[PDB]
């Protein structure tokens, strides 16, 4: 082509958006923003497809244009604004609050959350650089730059952002024994304790993780998000606890859970 693409076909969309085959040729094509377009959920899919508030891609316009929707505490009037991981969606006309966390199957989830928790979010530190008369900066995975960080914040750690002010409150460092969520790959949405981190200089670090049932897995280092210090998550978790069931016992859960009916 000559210059950038503005459309997204539907079959070429991310798999986790769960758009069906026969509704159209095109998919919502996320706007440029804090998140990669493969790693995000546009606001039109959260309102029309997941929450079933809207029914067409004109009612999402009519909802967002009444300024009823705050994404990380700022009002968003773009329906294809890419909301990504750990983003807080506050709808104040109804009274709900959501956080975008992955579930055990590699998609996002409708995770309703308490407005006492919706005042903060976690971010992962991505590059730390000095400059401009010797003033240090962070860059997180939301492109949030927070100048003057704590000197004990390094790369691959986790900060906790206050969402009304933009400032760091307290952090977690990258160590063994910390509770982490995988945000990419085939182990995506899984929660476990960091066991081990193997270094491959000139290539990617591999971080072996251990479940709460004993299921060990590994990822590359970039798909690792430190959620808690020790084993206590600093955010809430979804209905499943980040623990992937194999399909046999995932069947057993259904064929035993239907027997509570009557």
């Amino acid at each position: 082509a000559r210059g950038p693409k503005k459309h997204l076909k539907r079959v070429a969309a991310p798999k986790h958006w769960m758009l069906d085959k026969l509704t159209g040729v095109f998919a919502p094509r996320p706007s440029t923003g804090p998140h990669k377009l493969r790693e995000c959920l546009p606001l039109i899919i959260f309102l029309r497809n997941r929450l079933k508030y809207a029914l067409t891609g004109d009612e999402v316009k009519k909802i967002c244009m009444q300024r009823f929707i705050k994404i990380d505490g700022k009002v968003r009037t773009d329906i294809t604004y890419p909301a990504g991981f750990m983003d807080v969606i506050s709808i104040d006309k109804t009274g709900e609050n959501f956080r975008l966390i992955y579930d055990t199957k590699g998609r996002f989830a409708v995770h309703r959350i308490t407005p006492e928790e919706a005042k903060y979010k976690l971010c992962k530190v991505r590059k730390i650089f000095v400059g401009t008369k010797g003033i240090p900066h962070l860059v997180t995975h939301d492109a949030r730059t927070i100048r003057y960080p704590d000197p004990l914040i390094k790369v691959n750690d986790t900060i906790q952002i206050d969402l009304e002010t933009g400032k760091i409150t307290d952090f977690i460092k990258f160590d063994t024994g910390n509770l982490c969520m995988v945000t990419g790959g085939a182990n995506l949405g899984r929660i476990g304790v960091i066991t081990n981190r193997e270094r491959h200089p000139g290539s990617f670090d591999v971080v072996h993780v251990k479940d709460a049932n004993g299921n060990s897995f590994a990822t590359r280092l970039s798909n690792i998000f430190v959620i808690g210090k020790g084993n206590k998550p600093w955010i809430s978790l979804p209905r499943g606890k980040g623990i992937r069931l194999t399909i046999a016992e995932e069947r057993d859960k259904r064929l035993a859970a239907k027997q509570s009916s009557g």
């Binding site: 508030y53 809207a54 029914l55 009612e59 009519k62 009444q66 009823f68 006309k93 109804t94």
Partner: peptide
């Protein structure tokens, strides 16, 4: 049944 408080209808 579901009440939209932000479109002011019960669908």
């Amino acid at each position: 049944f579901m009440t939209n408080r932000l479109l002011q209808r019960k669908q």
